[PDB]
Amino acid sequence: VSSMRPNIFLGVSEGSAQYKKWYYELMVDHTEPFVTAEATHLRVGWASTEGYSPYPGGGEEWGGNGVGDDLFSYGFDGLHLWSGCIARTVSSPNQHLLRTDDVISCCLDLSAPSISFRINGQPVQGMFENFNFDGLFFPVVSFSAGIKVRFLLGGRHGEFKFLPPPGYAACYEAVLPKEKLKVEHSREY
Amino acid sequence: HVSSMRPNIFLGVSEGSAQYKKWYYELMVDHTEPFVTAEATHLRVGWASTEGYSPYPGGGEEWGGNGVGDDLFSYGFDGLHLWSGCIARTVSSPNQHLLRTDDVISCCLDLSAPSISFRINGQPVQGMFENFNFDGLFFPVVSFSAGIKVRFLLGGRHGEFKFLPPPGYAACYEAVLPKEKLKVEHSREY
């Protein structure tokens, strides 16, 4: 499984009076038809830097693993929410596994805290809430071979298809000052 | 304009056993564009240190994905020049040229010297990096403009070298953390 993420890192510093509600969308451009359902993986959501792999000297690195396959990430696959390698079904209109032209809205509310999703503008009935966190969250997607997706982070270069829920800010605005917005892709060698 | 790639191989000094202090990999250039006037190209390969990561709140540190040699924590070669701190140092080699299709660049990191040196199509590049501080962990890295296609040859089954590493050098592939899978990360402007 491959993974992609932008360089957008969201957290709370107590007393900083930060913006705490963040929104982005993912558009699915292509999935592979001629592959089996067990060989297909497409999940989108959020992950925490607390899930990084440790290195000598206190270093920590993103592992690029499947969204929801650990205790520090939270994914949606169209039918299910994933966390801790466990899937749970959630309802949405016309619910289906993620496919070409789906637009997934991803919501992170660090004041709750909560994570929720929309599919093609419509609420997904089921959320993650009151999870403990100790790190920074980033948008993330994981996918099997040949799948093509794009982050829509807001603004001229990734316009949202849907209006964010009240109180939510566009993820592109959270880039660190002086850094350029970039997308990182991880794949097995 | 410029993208960057790296494997998850991190090389550094420790107080433990250190049979291998000299590390080697190759980069194969699969495609560069022939000469065109409407665009300038960029292709640099070498090494970077985690000390060049960008700091984030809470002590986080992230790879910036910037051009190799565009800061004081990375060390790049482009066929004609070595780059560090955004400055180019002219070096020489036989049959000299900016990197092009089918070039194989050897990259060498010697943590005992310390030094970073290069070969091009098997021949030594005359001019190396030597009088640098080498704090942090080093990783192979490449930076390139759009449409350029390159591959790391790190050693191991999936990336055999075209040339023998110089005496005393070990393949980067051997330094993967034992619980990690070998992956390549690609950074691109959004």
Author numbering:
A (entry chain B): 652 to 840
B (entry chain A): 651 to 840
Direct quotes from the study:
The ryanodine receptor 2, RyR2, is a large tetrameric Ca2+ release channel located in the cardiomyocyte sarcoplasmic reticulum that governs the Ca2+ release involved in the excitation–contraction coupling (ECC). Its gating properties are modulated by numerous accessory proteins, such as the 12.6-kDa FK506-binding protein (FKBP12.6). The I784F variant is located in the cytosolic portion of RyR2 within the SPRY1 domain, which contains part of the binding site for FKBP12.6, a regulator of the channel opening probability. The binding site of FKBP12.6 is formed by the handle, SPRY1 and SPRY3 domains.
We solved the crystal structure of the RyR2 SPRY1 domain with the variant I784F at 1.45 Å resolution. There are two molecules in the asymmetric unit. The overall structure of I784F is similar to that of the wild type, consisting of two antiparallel β-sheets, a lid region, a β-hairpin finger and three 310 helices. In addition, the two flexible loops with no visible electron density in the WT, including in the FKBP-interacting loop, have clear density in the mutant structure. While the root mean-squared deviation (RMSD) between the WT and I784F structures is only 0.34 Å over 177 Cα atoms, I784F clearly changes the conformation of the loop where the mutation is located. The mutation site faces a hydrophobic pocket formed by loop 663, loop 764 and loop 784. To fit the bulky side chain of Phe784, the main chain of loop 784 shifts away from the pocket by ~ 2.0 Å. Surprisingly, the variant reduces the melting temperature of the domain by 7° (~ 41 °C vs ~ 48 °C for WT), suggesting a strong destabilizing effect exerted by the variant.
